[PDB]
Amino acid sequence: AIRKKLVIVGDGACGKTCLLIVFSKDQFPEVYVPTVFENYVADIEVDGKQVELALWDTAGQEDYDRLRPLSYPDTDVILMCFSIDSPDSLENIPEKWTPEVKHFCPNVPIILVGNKKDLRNDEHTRRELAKMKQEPVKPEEGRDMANRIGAFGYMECSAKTKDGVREVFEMATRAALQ
Amino acid sequence: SMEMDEKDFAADSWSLAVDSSFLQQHKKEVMKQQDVIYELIQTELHHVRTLKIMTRLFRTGMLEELHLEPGVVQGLFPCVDELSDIHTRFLSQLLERRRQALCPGSTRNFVIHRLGDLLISQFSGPSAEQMCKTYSEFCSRHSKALKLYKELYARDKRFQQFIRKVTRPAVLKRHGVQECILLVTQRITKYPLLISRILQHSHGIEEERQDLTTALGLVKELLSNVDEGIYQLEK
Ligand SMILES: CC(=O)Nc1cccc2cc[nH]c12
Predict the structure, then answer these.
(1) Ligand 1 pocket by C-beta < 6 Å: which residues?
(2) Closest CA to ligand 1's atom 10
(3) How close, in Å, is residue B224 to chain A by CA atoms?
(4) Are B85 and B134 in contact (CB under 8 A)?
(5) Positive or negative, the Cα torsion across A157, A115, A150, A152?
(6) Which residues are glycosylated (chain A)?
(7) Which H or E run contains A7?
(8) Could you give all domains of chain A from N- to C-terminal order, each with its CATH number?
């Protein structure tokens, strides 16, 4: 088993902590959803290859520009997260997170991940967004953003229903192996 | 870590740690507050355990088994004794606050009503100045500790065999040398997340809401100070 390091980046409300928790437990917590994620080393077998995937979160470091890059050394794959119920978090991807990840992690593949894809069918989400002249992120907007920033690929998931979560992490493992 | 505290913090939440007949006696708002307080102590116990692996297993193990150049071990584990002192003291106060709150006849049923006062004390005065100074030093030496570790692992067979040996148990899976360093660096930015969610569920007693709001402002002032005092050292 080879050792690979994954770092998840994105705005505070992008659901990155929830995505790591649901993957590491292989379950959406039924009694309590933890506030924080420490680290985790997943035993993953993708396309016949066994890999140890150490998982890291950047939550809490969004305001500390000198502390935050200390999470980047030796990263093999970056998950760049945005929330489908938040078009403003998608707009911050090319001008804030992408130049930072390219400077500190040159030649590291980035997977652009659209989180909370369940909220694209939420009536409360669609109503709250319409009051600010907005709507949930469409799949083509996510793909066009992933194309614009030169991402390895574009993926969507729902940490709440577990849909697409295993696939994102098996793809990240494959990306880390190239 | 000691079996006593490991068992008191083995459950996934406060609602699962206490007896269900005790849980049934409390309002949902109290349970929500207590679950987040339990997570703060549980992660503080884990952070102190991480610092003990760095000082007793890694640092001391290298001093007693290897023939490393003087000052090399210090460069791999900067400020670990100072950090271990700061956090073992804070953990002791958190565990004592829980112990005083236990019901008679019980080693698991408790409700912590006052945490803000404890948090203001840790994040103000001399203790805050010692955390600011120690984290500004630690995080400035972070990159050099990693580079030095990678240099020794690839060039020294004895260092490689020492590392492979002391990190072989399953309990150390997510606790290698580089993992311990990043776990320590990331700890300070977890506090505002934990305190803000405790504050979200502590509006019942106005004194407590005010104390938690002050504690949150102090942790953020500390974080901004540590962030401003950092500059990576290069070897
Ligand atoms: C920004 C980014 O994703 N860069 C990158 C690095 C290494 C491989 C790939 C494959 C697509 N993109 C790659």
Answers:
(1) A 107-110, 150-152
(2) A152
(3) 7
(4) no
(5) negative
(6) 32, 35
(7) strand A2-10
(8) 3-177 (3.40.50.300)
